Amino acid sequence: AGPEIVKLKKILREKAVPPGTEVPLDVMRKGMEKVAFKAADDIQVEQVTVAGCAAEWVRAPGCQAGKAILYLHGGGYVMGSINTHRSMVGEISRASQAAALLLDYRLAPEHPFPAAVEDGVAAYRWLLDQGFKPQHLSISGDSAGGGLVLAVLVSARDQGLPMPASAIPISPWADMTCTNDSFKTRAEADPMGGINKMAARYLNGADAKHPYASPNFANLKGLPPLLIHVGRDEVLLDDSIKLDAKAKADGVKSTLEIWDDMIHVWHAFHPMLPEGKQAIVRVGEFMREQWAA
C-alpha cells in the first residue's frame, strides 16, 4: 500500500545483525546513539534535572502554556536516551502543542526494575509539584517506555496520585514473559531471542508477571483514556491487543489502532515515512481531544 515502508523495510533488513548474534550491551547502546535522528531545527530544548535524572523539555512551536507530556523512551529498559528519542518527541510536541518532558530514567542492568518505574512516578510527581494540573497532563512512551507509561499509571494510582488526562503507549512492551503469539506469527514481517535478554536484564530474577513490570497483568481500574498504536507487522502485536482487551475489562477507554503494513514505532521514521508523520499528527490529535473534554 506504501512505497515508503517497502523502501524502509528493505533498508532495515539490509542493516540488521543476523538473527541470534550476541551483541554487547555497550555495542547496542552506542549504535543506537550513533544512528539517532537529529531533531528538527525549530525544536528548542532545555536541559533540566527531574528526580535526580537528567531530562530535557522538548518544545516544538505552538506550544501551549498549561500543558505537558511525560515522555518515556524505548530501548528494552537497557538502552535509549534523551538523544535517541529527541527527534520523534519534538514531532509529538508539534502535533499536540504541548512541551514534552523527556526523561533519562535509570537503565538496566546497572539499575534493575523497579528503578525505571520509580523514576516515572517521580517525574510525574515532580510535574504535579511544579503545578501542572493532572487534567493538563499526558503520558506517552514507546516500546519498553510504552509499558512504563502503564506501569507508572498503575503505580502512581496505588500511591494516591491523580490520573493525567490521557495516555499514549506506542508499540508497548507490557509483558516481560514474551510468550505471546505474534512473537511467532508476526516475526517474518518485523525487519526489526534478543528481547528476552532484555527481560532478563531488567527483571534480574523478579516476577515477570509483576504488575509494574508487565502491566498487561496489572489492575488497570481508574486509568485515564488510552490510544495504543502498534503495527500489524511487528513482533509485539499481541502486547497491544491484550493491553486493550485488559483495559476494556478494567473499565478503561482505549482505542487500539493496528496500522497495517507498519513496523515497530514507525513513528520514528517520520522523516521518510508518510504513515510516520500521520501517526504522530494523530497522537497529538488524541492528546488534544482529551484535553478539550
182 close to 176: Cβ distance less than 8 angstroms: no
Look at the block and give the residue holding cell 506506542: 170
Q: What's the number of CA atoms in the CB half-sphere (13 Å) around residue 40?
A: 15
Describe the crossing of helices 115-129 and 144-158 by its angle, rounded to 10 degrees: 60
Closest CA to 31 of 39, 23, 40, 19: 23
CB 223 within 8 A of CB 154: yes
CA distance 266 to 233: 10
> What is the amino acid identity at position 210?
H
Experimental method: X-ray
| CB-based contact 55:101 (threshold 8 Å) | yes
Question: What does the angle CA 97 – CA 100 – CA 106 come to, to the nearest 5 degrees?
Answer: 165
191 Cβ contact list (under 8 Å, min separation 6)? 9, 12, 13, 16, 263
Give residues with Cβ within 8 angstroms of 242, minimum separation 6. 174, 175, 180, 216
Count Cα neighbours of 249 within 13 Å in the Cβ-side half-sphere: 11
In contact, 142 and 267? CB cutoff 8 Å: yes
Note if 81 is an active site residue: no
19 CB-near residues (< 8 Å, 6+ apart): none
Joined together, the cell numbers standing for residue 175 give 509483558
User: Which amino acid is it at 282?
Assistant: R
CA 216 to CA 242: how far, in whole Å? 7
Among candidate residues 73, 86, 4, the one with its CA nearest the CA of residue 43: 86
CA–CA dist 202, 197 (Å, integer): 9
Q: Tell me if 4 sits within 8 A of 273, measured CB to CB.
A: yes
Cβ atoms of 231 and 262 within 8 Å: the answer is yes
Tell me the structure's resolution in angstroms, rounded to a single decimal: 2.4
Q: Mark 178-208 as b/e (b = at least 16 C-beta within 10 Å).
A: bebebbeebeebbbbeebeebbebbbeeeeb
Contacts of 158 (CB under 8 A, 6+ apart): none
- Three-state secondary structure readout of the chain: CCHHHHHHHHHHHHHCCCCCCCCCHHHHHHHHHHCCCCCCCCCEEEEEEECCEEEEEEECCCCCCCCEEEEECCCCCCCCCHHHHHHHHHHHHHHHCCEEEEECCCCCCCCCCCHHHHHHHHHHHHHHHCCCCHHHEEEEEECHHHHHHHHHHHHHHHCCCCCCCEEEEECCCCCCCCCCCHHHHCCCCCCCCHHHHHHHHHHCCCCCCCCCCCHHHCCCCCCCCEEEEEECCCCCHHHHHHHHHHHHHHCCCEEEEEECCCCCCHHHHCCCCHHHHHHHHHHHHHHHHHHHC
Contacts of 7 (CB under 8 A, 6+ apart): 272
Catalytic residue among 136, 264, 267, 270: 264
In the set 143, 166, 182, 240, the catalytic residue is 143
Closest CA to 215 of 194, 239, 237: 239
Establish whether 264 is a catalytic residue.
yes
Measured CA distances, 233 to 1, 182, 275, 282 (Å): 13, 9, 14, 20
Q: Distance between CA 173 and CA 151 in Å, rounded?
A: 11
- Indicate if 143 belongs to the active site: yes
The C-alpha cell that represents 194 in the structure block: 534478543
Q: What does the block give as the cell for 146? A: 510504552
Burial-class residue 121 by CB neighbours within 10 Å (0-12, 13-18, 19+).
buried
Rounded CA separation 147/255 (Å): 16
Q: Give yes or no for a contact between 203 and 195, defined as CB atoms under 8 angstroms apart.
A: no
Instruction: Catalytic residue, from 56, 91, 234, 275: name it.
Output: 234
In the chain, what are the domains?
Answer: 1-293 (3.40.50.1820)
